Design a protein around this ligand. Structure first.
Ligand SMILES: CC(=O)N1CCc2ccccc2[C@@H]1CC(=O)O
Lengths: 237, 300
């Protein structure tokens, strides 16, 4: 069935599960041609596949060569996503394979089910959570590795850095979604909040700054304020 | 012309014979149906007046034997039986007529409808979908589930239609996932036509049998199978041309025969909008499209 806020804590139990977000797979810039027309140019994209309990992110970079000579690219992108996720699962040992894959967009259900026919015990499900994983490319180090790629490439990250040493998976996922929601809502101001103090650094091997416990509380408040401020601006409240 | 005598009619019932129907009152003097255009196939079906739950009936071919109906007061239904003593049967059917207590199969000479609906239906294939080898006729009712449905609980009482599942390994070649899901031609031509049904005649026969079980008994699994077999053809970009042109005729007569007030339950909006307006074969069903629009425009 579909995932929602009733069975929300289930996300952090011991059944391995993976979120799959396909919104950054096919990416284009829209520009004007010489005859005056408008043309698209693809840029590298990525599949965002995230185990929410451990933070592990399987970032499959989708290089623009995938699209060459192909038609109906927004349709193809869903099937290419499904092909790559299936391949990822197949590459894994059985005890590391996911029992469930949750797709953030319902259009991914049939492509993924078809590609996963060899795994009839892996449940493929939509979600009613509005998750902000489309803003993954607002994370500088993710955007940089995607744009620099010259061929298809899989990159592994822990999107929680070392947070699980100090907080629970539930709490880490809430912090992640708050940060990404803020980045999606006002990217430049969210980045200001995070990079405001040059004395707090991002480790070479991390994605986010090395905040103390109390600094994270402050940062989270500031991100909640940014989101609420933007809501009021948008709806005149 | 063959005859299906009835021993009696102890309970009030609506009796269908092929596309026709009539009513019999409780304990009315009624001794069956005469003047039946022998064909290759017939169906006789029942819906009891005092309980319209369970419609049920029997598919039969008059050329396979002499059949009659007798009410069973223990199981509470009209049962088909075969009379193996031919001299006895001839004695009855020449007399019951001679008493005039039978209804005449009312065939208009212009009406070709029953054969247009059952052209490809054959008893030998019916008896493989409905497994009961001790009888030459086959019982179907409103409640019987299909083998496919069972896979998602008595195998003796199942409808063994060919399983069609668009999201199955049988339907999708590894390495051709998108191709075969978006164009079901492989599954139609290699798997179903060449592999399982062997020819289009057997395919159309099961499609026609499923339609008729859905319409005459309100059998839900038969309706699913009918729609699945239509959608498989329509969703294939490559279909022999003889098959497409014949499909249009088959579906036209099915739509023409459907009760007008049964549309909310016998026609799947998604399948029909897809087949008539979106699918590879949208422009290949001209006559079916025309009857559907002018008879059921609300579904589309
Ligand atoms: C499915 C999933 O998230 N895996 C399994 C495969 C894998 C491979 C390399 C690094 C991390 C992982 C993680 C670790 C884990 O969650 O148990």
């Amino acid at each position: 069935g579909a995932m929602n806020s009733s069975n929300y804590a289930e996300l952090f139990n011991n059944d391995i599960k993976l979120f799959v977000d396909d919104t950054n797979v096919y990416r284009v810039t829209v520009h004007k041609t010489f005859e005056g027309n408008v043309a698209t140019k693809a840029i590298n994209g990525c599949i965002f596949t995230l185990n929410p309990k451990t933070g592990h992110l399987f970032l499959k970079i989708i290089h623009t060569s995938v699209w060459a000579g192909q038609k109906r690219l927004s349709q193809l992108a869903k099937w290419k996503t499904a092909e790559e996720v299936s391949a990822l699962v197949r590459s894994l040992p059985k005890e590391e394979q996911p029992k469930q894959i949750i797709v953030t967009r319902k259009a991914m259900l049939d492509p993924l089910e078809v590609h996963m026919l060899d795994f009839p015990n892996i449940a493929i499900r939509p979600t009613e959570l509005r998750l902000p994983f489309s803003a993954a490319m607002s994370i500088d180090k993710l955007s940089d590795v995607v744009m620099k790629a010259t061929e298809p490439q899989m990159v592994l990250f822990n999107i929680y850095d070392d947070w699980l040493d100090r907080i629970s998976s539930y709490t880490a996922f809430s912090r992640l979604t708050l940060l990404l929601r803020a980045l999606k809502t006002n990217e430049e101001s969210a980045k200001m909040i995070l990079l405001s103090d040059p004395t707090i650094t991002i480790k070479s091997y991390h994605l986010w700054p090395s905040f103390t416990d109390e600094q994270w509380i402050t940062i989270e408040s500031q991100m909640r304020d940014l989101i609420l401020t933007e809501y009021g601006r948008k709806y005149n409240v | 012309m063959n005859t299906v005598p009835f021993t009696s009619a102890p309970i009030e019932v609506t009796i269908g014979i092929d596309q026709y129907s009539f009513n019999v009152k409780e304990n009315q003097p009624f001794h069956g149906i005469k003047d039946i255009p022998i064909g290759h196939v017939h169906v006789i079906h029942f819906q009891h007046a005092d309980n319209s739950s369970m419609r049920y009936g029997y598919w039969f071919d008059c050329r396979m034997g002499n059949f009659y109906i007798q009410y069973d007061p223990k199981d509470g239904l009209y049962k088909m039986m075969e009379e193996r003593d031919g001299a006895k049967f001839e004695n009855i059917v020449h007399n019951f007529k001679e008493r005039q207590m039978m209804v005449s199969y009312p065939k208009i000479d212009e009406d070709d409808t029953w054969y247009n609906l059952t052209e490809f239906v054959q008893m030998d294939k019916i008896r493989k979908i409905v497994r009961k080898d001790e009888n030459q006729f086959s019982y179907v009712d409103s409640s019987m589930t299909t083998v496919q449905e069972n896979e998602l609980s008595d195998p003796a009482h199942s409808l063994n239609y060919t399983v069609i599942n668009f999201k199955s390994r049988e339907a999708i070649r590894p390495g051709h996932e998108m191709e075969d899901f978006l164009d079901k031609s492989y599954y139609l031509n290699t798997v179903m036509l060449q592999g399982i049904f062997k020819n289009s005649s057997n395919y159309f026969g099961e499609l026609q049998f499923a339609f008729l079980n859905a319409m005459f008994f309100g059998n839900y699994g038969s309706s699913l199978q009918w729609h699945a077999m239509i959608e498989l053809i329509c969703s294939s970009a490559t279909v022999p041309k003889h098959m497409l042109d014949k499909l249009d005729e088959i579906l036209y007569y099915q739509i023409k025969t459907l009760p007008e007030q049964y549309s909310d339950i016998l026609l799947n909006e998604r399948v029909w909008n897809i087949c008539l307006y979106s699918s590879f074969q949208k422009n290949s069903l001209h006559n079916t499209e025309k009857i559907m629009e002018n008879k059921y425009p609300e579904l589309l």
